[PDB]
Amino acid sequence: ASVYAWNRKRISNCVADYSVLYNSASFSTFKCYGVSPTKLNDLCFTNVYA
C-alpha cells in the first residue's frame, strides 16, 4: 500500500516460522522491540497484525 493509507492484515489460527522470515536475509532490516527475533519461535500470541 501507499503509506498515506497503509494496509493491515490480521493473522490468526495458524502455525508460524519466524526463523524462515529471519533467514530471508534480503530483508535490509529486522529491528525488534520487546522481543528478540530468535525467541519468537519459542513464544506465542493472541493475534499478529501485519
Place this chain on the structure above:
Amino acid sequence: DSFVIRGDEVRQIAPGQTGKIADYNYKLPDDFTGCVIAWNSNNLDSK
C-alpha cells in the same frame, strides 16, 4: 582470528549474536575482550 564473509553478516560478529554464522561456526563469548575490524573486499574477493 581472520576470515571473509558477505558484508550483510558483519553484524553477527559480536558477543551474544545469532544467525547462520554466529550459531554454527564463529561464536564469540558474551564477555569477549577485543576488537572486531572489518572492511569491504569486493576489489579482491569477487570474480
